[PDB]
Design brief:
Chain lengths: ~20, ~290
């Protein structure tokens, strides 16, 4: 086995996390 | 323990106006500490784990962000989890955070794993918030119970003999993994030495070899140190936490090391994303990042 990396990052936005 | 009742109560605040507390009874929380300690001591101090699993860095008492991590990654035991330490301090809900993590460790002991961070240490968490939270909501005796639990956390993990995981980083004292295995628990974190380094050290792009760490604890290490460590131990990747990074994950030394940090907008001062790394059965790693928004 060999460690590899997926180039595609999945991004999510979390509302309310500025100024909790 | 009625572990099911405890988890149900911890999870039922999802969707509530964030900041809402779960008030377990003192004896339930004590129960979590005592039972998890038994489990920690019965399992290796250097974990041997198999993919697939999801890996998270610092949480620092950000309980509602932890809940979002589980919502995206899947609630145990739908996914296996390895956390890299720093569950408490510098957040608003360390108690709920550590209680849910210990509860999951107890319910799914072979699907859910927790490593020790530098904040899982009485001298540190007395100052940076956890002691105050315990004192306010319960009492000192419960905080002391947590310390006895933290003193038994495992220190590192190796995923499919290829990914070395720990909170901080490498140590110039570390020649064989057996040195980690021979650390006896319960133990406090010393002010210097192997265990200290594993919880406190940092990679640095401007250091050649080892350097004194600017934090004033432990060391910094360079990219060639990483390369030699990996070559010597037949490893592919070091996975660690312990540093706030803008996108929640950050590579070092041509992807031979990765830093993960899972607390978005840490301290409400950094505008960092939190990241979670998924490792599939083939050891392909992918990232999910939680970006803070207004
Ligand atoms: Mn931390
Ligand atoms: Mn740390």
């Amino acid at each position: 086995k060999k460690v590899t990396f997926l180039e595609e990052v999945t991004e999510y936005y979390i509302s309310g996390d500025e100024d909790r | 323990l009625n572990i099911d009742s405890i988890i149900q109560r911890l999870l039922e605040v999802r969707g509530s106006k964030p900041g809402k507390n779960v008030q377990l009874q003192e004896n339930e929380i004590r129960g979590l500490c005592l039972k998890s300690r038994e489990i920690f001591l019965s399992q290796p101090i250097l974990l041997e784990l198999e993919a697939p699993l999801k890996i998270c860095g610092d949480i620092h008492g950000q309980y509602y962000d932890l809940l979002r991590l589980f919502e995206y990654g899947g609630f145990p035991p739908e996914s296996n989890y390895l956390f890299l330490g720093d569950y408490v301090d510098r957040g608003k809900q360390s108690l709920e955070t550590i209680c849910l993590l210990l509860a999951y460790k107890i319910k799914y002991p072979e699907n859910f794993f927790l490593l020790r961070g530098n904040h899982e240490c009485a001298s540190i968490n007395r100052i940076y918030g956890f002691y105050d939270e315990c004192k306010r909501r319960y009492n000192i005796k419960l905080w002391k119970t947590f310390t006895d639990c933290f003193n038994c956390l495992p220190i590192a993990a190796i995923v499919d003999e290829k990914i070395f995981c720990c909170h901080g980083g490498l140590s110039p004292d570390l020649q064989s993994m057996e040195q980690i295995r021979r650390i006896m628990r319960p133990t406090d974190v010393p002010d210097q030495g192997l265990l200290c380094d594993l919880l406190w050290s940092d990679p640095d792009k401007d250091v050649l070899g080892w350097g004194e760490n600017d934090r004033g604890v432990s060391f910094t290490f360079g990219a060639e140190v990483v390369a030699k460590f990996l070559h010597k131990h037949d490893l592919d990747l070091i996975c660690r936490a312990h540093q706030v990074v803008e996108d929640g994950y950050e590579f070092f030394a041509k992807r031979q090391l990765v830093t993960l940090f899972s607390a978005p907008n840490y301290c409400g001062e950094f505008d960092n994303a939190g990241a979670m790394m998924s490792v599939d059965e083939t050891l392909m790693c992918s990232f999910q990042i939680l970006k803070p928004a207004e």
